[PDB]
Short mmCIF file of C-alpha atoms and ligand atoms in Angstrom, two decimals:
data_model
loop_
_atom_site.label_atom_id
_atom_site.label_comp_id
_atom_site.label_asym_id
_atom_site.label_seq_id
_atom_site.Cartn_x
_atom_site.Cartn_y
_atom_site.Cartn_z
CA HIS A 1441 -9.44 17.20 12.34
CA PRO A 1442 -10.77 19.91 9.96
CA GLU A 1443 -7.38 21.57 9.53
CA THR A 1444 -6.03 18.28 8.21
CA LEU A 1445 -8.93 18.33 5.76
CA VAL A 1446 -7.81 21.87 4.84
CA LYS A 1447 -4.26 20.64 4.10
CA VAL A 1448 -5.81 17.97 1.85
CA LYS A 1449 -7.95 20.51 -0.02
CA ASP A 1450 -5.00 22.86 -0.44
CA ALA A 1451 -2.84 20.00 -1.69
CA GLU A 1452 -5.50 19.24 -4.30
CA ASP A 1453 -5.53 22.81 -5.64
CA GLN A 1454 -1.76 23.24 -5.43
CA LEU A 1455 -1.02 19.94 -7.20
CA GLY A 1456 -3.88 20.63 -9.62
CA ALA A 1457 -5.03 17.05 -9.07
CA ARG A 1458 -7.57 14.91 -7.22
CA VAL A 1459 -6.58 13.84 -3.71
CA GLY A 1460 -8.34 11.13 -1.71
CA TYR A 1461 -8.09 10.87 2.06
CA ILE A 1462 -9.38 8.62 4.85
CA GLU A 1463 -8.59 8.68 8.53
CA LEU A 1464 -9.69 5.53 10.33
CA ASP A 1465 -9.94 4.70 14.04
CA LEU A 1466 -8.19 1.31 14.18
CA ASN A 1467 -9.99 -0.13 17.12
CA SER A 1468 -13.63 0.68 16.15
CA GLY A 1469 -13.33 1.41 12.44
CA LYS A 1470 -14.94 4.81 13.00
CA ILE A 1471 -14.03 7.35 10.32
CA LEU A 1472 -12.31 10.43 11.72
CA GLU A 1473 -11.71 12.28 8.42
CA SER A 1474 -12.48 11.72 4.76
CA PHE A 1475 -12.09 13.44 1.40
CA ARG A 1476 -13.28 11.87 -1.87
CA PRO A 1477 -13.59 8.55 -0.02
CA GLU A 1478 -15.58 6.80 -2.81
CA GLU A 1479 -13.38 7.91 -5.71
CA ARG A 1480 -10.92 5.65 -7.47
CA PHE A 1481 -7.15 6.11 -7.48
CA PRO A 1482 -4.41 3.87 -8.89
CA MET A 1483 -3.02 1.72 -6.06
CA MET A 1484 0.52 1.59 -7.40
CA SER A 1485 2.85 -0.24 -5.01
CA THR A 1486 0.34 0.03 -2.15
CA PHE A 1487 -1.19 -3.12 -3.68
CA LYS A 1488 1.83 -5.14 -2.54
CA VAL A 1489 0.49 -5.15 1.02
CA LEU A 1490 -2.78 -6.67 -0.24
CA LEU A 1491 -0.75 -9.14 -2.30
CA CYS A 1492 1.16 -10.45 0.71
CA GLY A 1493 -2.11 -10.54 2.65
CA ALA A 1494 -3.36 -13.03 0.06
CA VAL A 1495 -0.08 -14.94 0.28
CA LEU A 1496 -0.33 -15.11 4.08
CA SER A 1497 -3.90 -16.40 3.86
CA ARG A 1498 -2.61 -19.25 1.72
CA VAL A 1499 0.13 -19.86 4.30
CA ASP A 1500 -2.48 -20.18 7.08
CA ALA A 1501 -4.43 -22.62 4.91
CA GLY A 1502 -1.25 -24.57 4.21
CA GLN A 1503 -1.45 -23.86 0.48
CA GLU A 1504 1.79 -21.91 0.86
CA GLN A 1505 4.84 -22.10 3.13
CA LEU A 1506 6.91 -19.02 4.05
CA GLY A 1507 10.13 -21.01 3.63
CA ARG A 1508 9.35 -22.35 0.16
CA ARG A 1509 12.10 -21.35 -2.24
CA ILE A 1510 11.38 -19.90 -5.67
CA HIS A 1511 13.93 -19.68 -8.48
CA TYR A 1512 13.57 -17.36 -11.47
CA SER A 1513 15.69 -16.07 -14.36
CA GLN A 1514 17.16 -12.92 -15.67
CA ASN A 1515 14.20 -12.53 -18.06
CA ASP A 1516 11.86 -12.23 -15.06
CA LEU A 1517 13.49 -9.01 -13.84
CA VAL A 1518 11.39 -5.92 -14.62
CA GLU A 1519 12.31 -2.31 -13.79
CA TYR A 1520 13.30 -1.60 -10.17
CA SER A 1521 14.13 -4.97 -8.64
CA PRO A 1522 16.81 -4.12 -6.05
CA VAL A 1523 16.53 -7.38 -4.10
CA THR A 1524 15.46 -10.03 -6.62
CA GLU A 1525 18.25 -9.06 -9.02
CA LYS A 1526 20.68 -10.23 -6.31
CA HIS A 1527 19.32 -13.78 -6.06
CA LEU A 1528 19.27 -15.24 -9.57
CA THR A 1529 21.39 -18.17 -8.37
CA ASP A 1530 20.11 -19.01 -4.87
CA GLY A 1531 16.52 -17.90 -5.46
CA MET A 1532 14.32 -16.47 -2.72
CA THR A 1533 11.86 -17.84 -0.19
CA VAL A 1534 8.25 -16.65 -0.20
CA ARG A 1535 8.98 -14.80 3.07
CA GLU A 1536 11.96 -13.04 1.47
CA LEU A 1537 9.86 -12.11 -1.56
CA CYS A 1538 7.18 -10.41 0.53
CA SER A 1539 9.90 -8.65 2.54
CA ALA A 1540 11.34 -7.40 -0.77
CA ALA A 1541 7.94 -6.40 -2.16
CA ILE A 1542 6.83 -4.46 0.92
CA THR A 1543 10.01 -3.10 2.53
CA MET A 1544 11.79 -2.25 -0.76
CA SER A 1545 8.85 -2.24 -3.21
CA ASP A 1546 10.70 -4.75 -5.40
CA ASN A 1547 8.67 -5.19 -8.59
CA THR A 1548 9.85 -8.63 -9.72
CA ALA A 1549 9.19 -9.86 -6.17
CA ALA A 1550 5.58 -8.66 -6.56
CA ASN A 1551 5.26 -10.43 -9.93
CA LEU A 1552 6.62 -13.72 -8.57
CA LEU A 1553 4.23 -13.46 -5.62
CA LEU A 1554 1.33 -12.77 -7.97
CA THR A 1555 2.19 -15.97 -9.84
CA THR A 1556 1.99 -18.00 -6.60
CA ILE A 1557 -1.65 -16.96 -6.10
CA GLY A 1558 -2.80 -17.05 -9.73
CA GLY A 1559 -2.31 -13.49 -10.97
CA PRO A 1560 -4.11 -10.11 -10.61
CA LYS A 1561 -7.57 -11.63 -11.16
CA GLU A 1562 -7.05 -13.98 -8.22
CA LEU A 1563 -5.83 -11.14 -6.02
CA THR A 1564 -9.10 -9.40 -6.92
CA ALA A 1565 -11.01 -12.60 -6.10
CA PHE A 1566 -9.27 -12.76 -2.71
CA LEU A 1567 -10.26 -9.15 -1.99
CA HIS A 1568 -13.80 -9.88 -3.15
CA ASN A 1569 -14.09 -12.80 -0.76
CA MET A 1570 -12.89 -10.76 2.21
CA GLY A 1571 -15.56 -8.14 1.60
CA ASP A 1572 -13.89 -5.66 -0.73
CA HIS A 1573 -15.93 -5.61 -3.95
CA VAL A 1574 -14.36 -2.30 -4.97
CA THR A 1575 -10.59 -2.73 -5.13
CA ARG A 1576 -9.30 -4.47 -8.26
CA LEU A 1577 -5.91 -5.51 -9.65
CA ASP A 1578 -5.80 -6.16 -13.38
CA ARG A 1579 -2.18 -5.97 -14.50
CA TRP A 1580 1.37 -6.79 -13.44
CA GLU A 1581 4.44 -4.68 -12.68
CA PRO A 1582 5.15 -2.28 -14.22
CA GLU A 1583 2.01 -1.83 -16.36
CA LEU A 1584 -0.30 -1.48 -13.35
CA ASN A 1585 1.14 1.97 -12.79
CA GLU A 1586 -0.09 3.47 -16.04
CA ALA A 1587 -2.69 5.64 -14.27
CA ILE A 1588 -4.70 6.45 -17.40
CA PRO A 1589 -7.34 9.07 -16.44
CA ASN A 1590 -10.62 7.47 -15.27
CA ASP A 1591 -9.22 3.98 -15.90
CA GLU A 1592 -10.60 1.65 -13.21
CA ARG A 1593 -7.95 -1.02 -13.71
CA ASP A 1594 -5.59 -1.41 -10.74
CA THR A 1595 -7.50 1.03 -8.54
CA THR A 1596 -8.98 1.26 -5.08
CA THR A 1597 -10.88 3.95 -3.19
CA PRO A 1598 -9.80 5.69 0.03
CA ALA A 1599 -12.59 3.95 1.96
CA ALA A 1600 -12.17 0.51 0.39
CA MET A 1601 -8.41 0.30 1.00
CA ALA A 1602 -8.70 1.70 4.53
CA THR A 1603 -11.28 -0.93 5.50
CA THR A 1604 -9.39 -3.73 3.72
CA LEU A 1605 -6.11 -2.77 5.42
CA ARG A 1606 -7.91 -2.72 8.77
CA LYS A 1607 -9.31 -6.15 8.16
CA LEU A 1608 -5.92 -7.55 7.12
CA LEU A 1609 -4.20 -6.11 10.19
CA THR A 1610 -6.87 -6.57 12.86
CA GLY A 1611 -9.74 -8.56 11.34
CA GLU A 1612 -10.61 -12.25 11.58
CA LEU A 1613 -9.17 -13.11 8.15
CA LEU A 1614 -5.56 -13.87 9.03
CA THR A 1615 -4.03 -15.76 11.94
CA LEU A 1616 -2.36 -13.68 14.65
CA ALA A 1617 1.05 -14.81 13.40
CA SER A 1618 0.25 -13.71 9.85
CA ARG A 1619 -1.18 -10.36 10.98
CA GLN A 1620 1.99 -9.77 12.98
CA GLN A 1621 4.18 -10.71 10.02
CA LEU A 1622 2.35 -8.33 7.74
CA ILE A 1623 2.53 -5.44 10.09
CA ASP A 1624 6.22 -6.26 10.69
CA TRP A 1625 6.98 -5.97 6.97
CA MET A 1626 5.13 -2.66 6.75
CA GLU A 1627 6.93 -1.38 9.86
CA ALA A 1628 10.23 -2.18 8.11
CA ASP A 1629 9.29 -0.05 5.06
CA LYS A 1630 12.50 1.54 3.71
CA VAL A 1631 11.13 3.55 0.76
CA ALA A 1632 8.57 5.86 2.40
CA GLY A 1633 11.07 8.04 4.28
CA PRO A 1634 9.99 11.51 3.15
CA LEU A 1635 6.25 10.94 3.60
CA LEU A 1636 4.25 10.31 6.72
CA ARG A 1637 7.35 9.17 8.64
CA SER A 1638 8.76 12.69 8.23
CA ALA A 1639 5.97 14.07 10.42
CA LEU A 1640 6.39 11.39 13.05
CA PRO A 1641 7.60 12.27 16.57
CA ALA A 1642 10.07 10.00 18.36
CA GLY A 1643 8.48 7.01 20.08
CA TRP A 1644 5.63 6.72 17.60
CA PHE A 1645 4.77 3.54 15.73
CA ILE A 1646 4.22 3.45 11.98
CA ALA A 1647 3.65 0.60 9.55
CA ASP A 1648 3.16 1.74 5.98
CA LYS A 1649 3.49 1.24 2.26
CA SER A 1650 3.83 3.95 -0.36
CA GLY A 1651 3.40 4.09 -4.10
CA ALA A 1652 4.19 6.18 -7.14
CA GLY A 1653 3.10 5.72 -10.73
CA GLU A 1654 2.51 7.50 -14.01
CA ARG A 1655 0.69 10.81 -14.48
CA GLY A 1656 1.62 12.19 -11.07
CA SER A 1657 0.13 9.36 -9.05
CA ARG A 1658 1.36 9.07 -5.46
CA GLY A 1659 -0.04 7.41 -2.37
CA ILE A 1660 0.49 5.86 1.03
CA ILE A 1661 -1.36 3.51 3.38
CA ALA A 1662 -0.43 3.37 7.05
CA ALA A 1663 -1.23 2.19 10.55
CA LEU A 1664 0.29 4.54 13.11
CA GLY A 1665 0.04 5.80 16.68
CA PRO A 1666 1.85 7.25 19.72
CA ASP A 1667 3.80 5.28 22.34
CA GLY A 1668 4.90 2.48 20.02
CA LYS A 1669 1.43 1.19 19.19
CA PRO A 1670 -0.77 1.89 16.16
CA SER A 1671 -4.25 3.32 16.75
CA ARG A 1672 -5.23 4.85 13.40
CA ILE A 1673 -5.29 3.91 9.76
CA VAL A 1674 -4.53 6.59 7.19
CA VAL A 1675 -4.96 6.24 3.46
CA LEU A 1676 -3.92 9.00 1.05
CA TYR A 1677 -3.88 9.00 -2.75
CA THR A 1678 -3.45 11.50 -5.55
CA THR A 1679 -3.31 11.20 -9.32
CA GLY A 1680 -3.24 13.51 -12.34
CA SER A 1681 -0.68 16.08 -11.17
CA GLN A 1682 2.25 17.31 -13.22
CA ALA A 1683 4.16 17.93 -9.99
CA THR A 1684 7.62 16.54 -9.27
CA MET A 1685 7.97 13.55 -6.98
CA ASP A 1686 9.54 15.89 -4.43
CA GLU A 1687 6.54 18.23 -4.23
CA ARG A 1688 4.15 15.31 -4.04
CA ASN A 1689 6.29 13.98 -1.18
CA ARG A 1690 6.21 17.35 0.59
CA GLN A 1691 2.44 17.69 0.20
CA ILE A 1692 1.96 14.30 1.87
CA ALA A 1693 4.43 15.26 4.61
CA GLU A 1694 2.46 18.42 5.26
CA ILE A 1695 -0.83 16.52 5.60
CA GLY A 1696 1.05 14.18 7.93
CA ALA A 1697 2.21 17.09 10.09
CA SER A 1698 -1.37 18.28 10.47
CA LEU A 1699 -2.48 14.73 11.30
CA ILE A 1700 0.08 14.59 14.11
CA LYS A 1701 -0.45 18.12 15.43
CA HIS A 1702 -4.20 17.53 15.77
CA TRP A 1703 -3.98 13.91 16.94
XE1 LIG B 264 -1.81 -2.45 13.32
XE1 LIG B 265 -1.20 14.50 -1.63
XE1 LIG B 266 2.18 11.27 10.35
XE1 LIG B 267 -0.78 11.30 5.24
#
């Protein structure tokens, strides 16, 4: 809806920073709304969904097993690792790592998962081979959040990430079990409270993943819909702003409210 587009435009001027927006019809892939859809934004933690997509593809192929246990050391723990810092002795299964990476945005979890697939370049190769020749991961946590202006490292575009998320969740790539697992992790997201979820009426479904990084970067990817079933994909990024986290949150929440009101 155009008034949602207005909220996006106003957010861009008010934050003094680029904002990218895509609204995708989940069933048909038809685009309902878009703003700067072919511009690059740092992915930040929204990449962790793509990461566990790659992991799940290896599970399907039998190259990985969800119950395989990984041990690591204290030296592996980078900033913000709320789950992995609790399992230095017992270790964590691959399933637990993806749960940590997506639901809690655990950074060390993401790094360990990256190692299982061969690093950022191999995540990019995975994306490439599923039809996304735009999105690229280059670095690890936390350096991938640097958000240097016009840097293309660790970026996606509104349109590329929307289509890739749609393919991961509903496309032929993953098995039904793996699609369901992925969406289940995103539905269990615990660190995107004040964003799209804030605009959500009771009874609605949402599966999402948010991100924040340097230089005012903020973003969220989501599959959502009324009556407990998702029907749209929404991708929203911004970078460059000097705004507080709280205002960036509120701007996203306001776009979300428009999205709902004009659903
Ligand atoms: Xe979905
Ligand atoms: Xe935003
Ligand atoms: Xe929303
Ligand atoms: Xe949003």
